[PDB]
Amino acid sequence: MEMEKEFEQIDKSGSWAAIYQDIRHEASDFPSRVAKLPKNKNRNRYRDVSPFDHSRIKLHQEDNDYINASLIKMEEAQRSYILTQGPLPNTVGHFWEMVWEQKSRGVVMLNRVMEKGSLKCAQYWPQKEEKEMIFEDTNLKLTLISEDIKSYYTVRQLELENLTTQETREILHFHYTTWPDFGVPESPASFLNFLFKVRESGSLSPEHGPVVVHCSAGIGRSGTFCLADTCLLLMDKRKDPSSVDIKKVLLEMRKFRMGLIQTADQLRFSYLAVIEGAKFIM
């Protein structure tokens, strides 16, 4: 069923809350036993948001391999994403270790460091060229190379150095800075442009490791970004684009991380983005 019509049918009937609860009821439940070990309590931002054991990213260290991060592998779309929480004061070194070890080119940040008067994630990248950051626990150095500030997003060029081998890599930081404190954006135009610019960078392409995507918990805004990208890629690839079922794509993605799309309003915004995105493509 053409989703644009499914959209108007749900809106006229005001059933967004009902569709959303149906997804919550049918979603996968897999064990998260490593996330709940007492040694990992200060590595989790939220007690109710954990990576499944089968899809968790493992750090390459014998001490403690745990980070709150999941690999979302989309087989038909041929895209992979790592979805993770906003880094904590004691996990900023783990975060950059993961980027290094997974060979990522891009980090996508969908939150501000402070929102609604509270800290939503650590200040985990340098703000000035001449004041670099050293992570002694993981033996990494991170330098700000350049910054491009636009009305709806900022793009930064970072240099990550493995101090053990003296190898360096260029990481691109894509920071969406205008998601409102309350609700979802009124139009998806600025969110779609932002996705286009991440795609244009190479960060989502198969010659690199998976993109790292985060917000505060790594399930809500983060869910919206990967769901929109995968649905638009499938519309490009298939003979019948009408066949793309956003609810079925979301349940596939929920096999790899719990809770993706946190509200009925985020579900409606994801439909609008794919639809308004489908409009521009034709």
Ligand SMILES: O=C(OCc1ccccc1)N1CCC(O)CC1
């Ligand atoms: O918002 C856009 O279109 C919708 C869309 C974005 C990303 C992936 C699929 C569809 N952009 C910004 C403007 C640029 O010219 C190119 C398109």
